[PDB]
Amino acid sequence: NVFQTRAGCLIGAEHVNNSYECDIPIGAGICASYQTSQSIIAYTMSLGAENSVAYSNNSIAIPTNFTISVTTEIL
Amino acid sequence: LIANQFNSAIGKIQDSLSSTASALGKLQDVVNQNAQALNTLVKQLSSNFGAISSVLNDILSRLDPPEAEVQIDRLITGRLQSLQTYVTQQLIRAAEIRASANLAATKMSECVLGQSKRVDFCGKGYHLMSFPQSAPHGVVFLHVTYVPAQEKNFTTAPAICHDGKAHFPREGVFVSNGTHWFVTQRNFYEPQIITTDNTFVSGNCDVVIGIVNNTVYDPLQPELDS
Amino acid sequence: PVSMTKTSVDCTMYICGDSTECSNLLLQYGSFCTQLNRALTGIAVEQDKNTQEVFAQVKQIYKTPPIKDFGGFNFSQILPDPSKPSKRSFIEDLLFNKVTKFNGLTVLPPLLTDEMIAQYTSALLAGTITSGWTFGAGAALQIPFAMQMAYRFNGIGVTQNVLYENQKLIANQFNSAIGKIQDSLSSTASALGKLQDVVNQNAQALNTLVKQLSSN
Amino acid sequence: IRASANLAATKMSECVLGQSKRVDFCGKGYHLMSFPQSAPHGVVFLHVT
Ligand SMILES: *[C@@H]1O[C@H](CO)[C@@H](O[C@@H]2O[C@H](CO)[C@@H](O)[C@H](O)[C@H]2NC(C)=O)[C@H](O)[C@H]1NC(C)=O
Numbered sequence: 001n002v003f004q005t006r007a008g009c010l011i012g013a014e015h016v017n018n019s020y021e022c023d024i025p026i027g028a029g030i031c032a033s034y035q036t037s038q039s040i041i042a043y044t045m046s047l048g049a050e051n052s053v054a055y056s057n058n059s060i061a062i063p064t065n066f067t068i069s070v071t072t073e074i075l
Numbered sequence: 076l077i078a079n080q081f082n083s084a085i086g087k088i089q090d091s092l093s094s095t096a097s098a099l100g101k102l103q104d105v106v107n108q109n110a111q112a113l114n115t116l117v118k119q120l121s122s123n124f125g126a127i128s129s130v131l132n133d134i135l136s137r138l139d140p141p142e143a144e145v146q147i148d149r150l151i152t153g154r155l156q157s158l159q160t161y162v163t164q165q166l167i168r169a170a171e172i173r174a175s176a177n178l179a180a181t182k183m184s185e186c187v188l189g190q191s192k193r194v195d196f197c198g199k200g201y202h203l204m205s206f207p208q209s210a211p212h213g214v215v216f217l218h219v220t221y222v223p224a225q226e227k228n229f230t231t232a233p234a235i236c237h238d239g240k241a242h243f244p245r246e247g248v249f250v251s252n253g254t255h256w257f258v259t260q261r262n263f264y265e266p267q268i269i270t271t272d273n274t275f276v277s278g279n280c281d282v283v284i285g286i287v288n289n290t291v292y293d294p295l296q297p298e299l300d301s
Numbered sequence: 302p303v304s305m306t307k308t309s310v311d312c313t314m315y316i317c318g319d320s321t322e323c324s325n326l327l328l329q330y331g332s333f334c335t336q337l338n339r340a341l342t343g344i345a346v347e348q349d350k351n352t353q354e355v356f357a358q359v360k361q362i363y364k365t366p367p368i369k370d371f372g373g374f375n376f377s378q379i380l381p382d383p384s385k386p387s388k389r390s391f392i393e394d395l396l397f398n399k400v401t402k403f404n405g406l407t408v409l410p411p412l413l414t415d416e417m418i419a420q421y422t423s424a425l426l427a428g429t430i431t432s433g434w435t436f437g438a439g440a441a442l443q444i445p446f447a448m449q450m451a452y453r454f455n456g457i458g459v460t461q462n463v464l465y466e467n468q469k470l471i472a473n474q475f476n477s478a479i480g481k482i483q484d485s486l487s488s489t490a491s492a493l494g495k496l497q498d499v500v501n502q503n504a505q506a507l508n509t510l511v512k513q514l515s516s517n
Numbered sequence: 518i519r520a521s522a523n524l525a526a527t528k529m530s531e532c533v534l535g536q537s538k539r540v541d542f543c544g545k546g547y548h549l550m551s552f553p554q555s556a557p558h559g560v561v562f563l564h565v566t
Pocket residue numbers: 065066076079080224
């Protein structure tokens with residue numbers, strides 16, 4: 001079950017097409033994680049969900065509501 | 076409504092901290108690196124450093140000075156480099172902490188003591204207020220931030236012609252729900268009827284691109300009409 | 302500069318050339334060999350954390366609308382060009398050309414490969430052009446680019462009507478401005494010096510390290 | 518470098534994602550917007566002022 005990547009020979013992991021959020025970094029854009037019965041999978045890193053913006057020269061979006069979110073920063 | 080959103084917001088912070096320790100990793104890392112480095116420092120003492128025995132008393136006891144010197148001088152040089160390395164480890168790591176301390180001090184001043192308009196300097200979204208909390212060898216901030224929630228589509232236009240004179244918003248945007256024209260504040264949808272109190276005239280229609288015909292209302296006129 | 306070449310030198314192979322006799326002698330010196338190895342790894346892992354901080358500041362990947370009607374402004378140069386193999390915009394390409402052994406040292410590859418980075422700078426560019434600052438605070442909100450620039454004047458104390466009356470003139474100044482960036486980058490490399498020094502100082506530092514092997 | 522990276526990260530947030538009133542923090546003159554461009558081991562900003 002050998003997979004070849006630019007980082008080096010990767011053995012004992014299953015290569016897959018579909019991408020997910022990076023979990024354990026290998027380098028050269030390959031991230032590996034534990035997934036379903038379960039095994040170790042190596043996949044191309046997913047940069048995030050794609051979202052085109054419905055832009056046009058006379059369309060504007062105005063929020064109608066708000067959420068007061070509290071987040072934590074540690075130093 | 077805000078109070079409920081704020082109060083529930085604090086509640087979530089506890090559970091995120093109460094059950095999951097991944098949040099406090101960054102403070103935890105500083106403790107480990109120092110404690111781990113110190114352990115290495117002490118461990119180096121038991122390394123013979125190319126001498127007959129790591130324990131000083133042995134080479135002290137078993138051999139009298141004339142040969143003891145050459146053995147000890149190897150131990151001293153070995154230990155000294157080990158201590159030299161540890162200090163340079165601390166000094167470099169000391170600089171990193173200070174850069175974090177000044178960054179914290181800057182946040183404490185610009186983010187707690189005052190509202191700061193620097194974007195994402197104080198947690199994602201527009202910033203309202205910050206609360207500080209102490210922590211082992213650290214400070215933890217609660218950033219209370221305002222985030223727009225439910226967007227909506229509206230057709231818009233730069234300006235309005237009323238009498239050939241182009242009208243721009245004093246504040247806010249010109250939005251139409253499809254059949255009527257309104258001016259509303261930028262970040263929240265509370266459309267109001269368009270009046271000269273909301274708009275200031277400039278120039279004539281032709282220059283501005285995209286301007287749309289509509290009616291601008293004047294509060295003074297119906298009062299003089301009456 | 303954001304990151305430097307992720308380099309790792311195996312402590313043992315460098316000092317001792319796979320000589321068991323040399324290796325055993327080294328074990329006397331204690332844990333020097335493992336500290337020096339681990340410290341360099343700490344630099345390597347930190348190194349990826351830099352590019353995360355600089356670029357991965359956007360939660361989604363926005364994509365510019367297919368039709369490039371931005372009120373007269375011309376982002377054709379800085380927006381990604383699908384024709385080239387790597388999804389890199391024209392200015393990004395000029396930079397990449399301007400910027401220019403087996404003793405146990407290895408160079409680990411970066412985590413975000415250059416194609417992936419160009420994706421973020423595509424996103425952050427697309428978000429700015431179609432959402433102003435809003436996409437930073439929360440969900441991205443479309444605003445026609447003419448007004449968004451008009452807001453920004455209202456930020457610096459110039460009332461809006463200045464821009465709308467002068468929209469045509471501003472566009473031409475902006476488009477010619479971008480054009481001037483190409484030539485300064487296209488012809489003169491002195492501007493891009495700061496990135497080159499990180500490569501030069503680092504690459505030089507290795508040469509000193511390797512040359513030391515040939516010292517008695 | 519990491520000192521430079523944080524400065525870039527601060528610049529990215531306060532200069533690209535938003536307009537900033539800090540003088541000369543985003544190029545000479547009043548600031549309007551910034552565009553980021555990738556570079557080998559670095560980031561290049563276009564400051565529109
Ligand atoms: C703005 O959003 C809030 C959501 O936080 C809405 O408040 C909720 O309203 C529903 C009614 O359908 C209640 O069941 C929820 O309990 C409310 N949330 C809270 C936290 O009390 C609010 O109605 C929205 N405002 C408008 C004008 O749509």
